[PDB]
């Protein structure tokens, strides 16, 4: 691929692959020139080496890439890593329909809901809004609907409150240590840019308010909502799984 400023970038495997291609060609030539064995051997020795540096570099002397001190990343290093397969290694693959910010308090909440910024929720649920706007006929087509929320027309808030209602979200805070690290809440729209967190759940998360951030996740499919409601909901997990005593103790 090209970059800006007309400079190119490329994988290290390319430096490797050429040398194997080159040395192979140069040996085919030497067999028809009937070169002395002392030479055609040395070529073989180099090809046997260059292949090995291609597959798993490091069980030899570590052939470096052209003009660059840094070692070149081999085929084996694309599987190996820290630890094992990178994709399954932390982290771990990023995921659409998510976000985060600072969390704050809000004692006026009931325990089965949570405070999600007005500004954030708009951007998050955008495909839901595009559907409902044109379903009820307030938009002729999606391309029109797109322009409406771009205009930030006041009509959308009343639509938004419909789509938000019975749809839980998942709240997750930084080091997920036990199963209580993800819990599901019902969103209540808030003017402000902070997440509002019911104070009693702070104990389970080992959340303080020194500026910790939490993530939100939208359960998309119909299945995931009913899954999040009967298993991951706040009120369903009030006992600690380590020792049967309540974890929703007053702090």
């Amino acid at each position: 691929v090209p970059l800006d400023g007309g400079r190119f970038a490329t994988s290290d495997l390319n430096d490797l692959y050429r040398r194997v291609i080159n040395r192979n060609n140069r040996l085919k030539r030497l067999l028809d020139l009937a070169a002395p064995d002392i030479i055609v051997r040395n070529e073989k020795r180099m090809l046997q080496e260059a292949v090995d540096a291609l597959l798993d570099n490091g069980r030899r002397g570590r052939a470096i890439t052209g003009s660059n001190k840094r070692p070149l990343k081999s085929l084996a290093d694309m599987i190996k890593g820290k630890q094992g397969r990178f994709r399954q290694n932390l982290l771990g693959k990023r995921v659409d329909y998510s976000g985060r910010s600072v969390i704050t308090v809000g004692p006026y909440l009931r325990l089965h809901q949570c405070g999600l910024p007005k500004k954030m929720a708009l951007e998050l649920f955008k495909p839901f809004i595009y559907g409902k706007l044109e379903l009820r006929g307030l938009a002729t087509t999606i391309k029109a609907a797109k322009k409406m929320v771009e205009r930030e027309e006041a009509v959308v808030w009343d639509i938004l409150d419909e789509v938000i209602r019975e749809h839980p979200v998942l709240l997750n805070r930084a080091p997920t240590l036990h199963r209580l690290g993800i819990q599901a809440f019902e969103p209540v729209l808030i003017e402000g840019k902070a997440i509002q967190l019911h104070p009693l759940v702070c104990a389970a998360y080992n959340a303080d308010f020194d500026g910790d951030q939490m993530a939100v996740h939208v359960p998309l499919t119909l299945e995931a909502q009913l899954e999040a409601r009967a298993l991951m909901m706040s009120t369903n997990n009030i006992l600690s799984p380590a020792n049967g005593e309540p974890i929703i103790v007053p702090s």
């Binding site: 040395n42 020795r45 180099m46 080496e49 030899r60 002397g61």
Partner: peptide, 10 residues
């Protein structure tokens, strides 16, 4: 690896 530079020279 008995470093290749030597055993050609030899």
């Amino acid at each position: 690896t008995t470093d290749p530079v030597r055993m050609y020279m030899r």
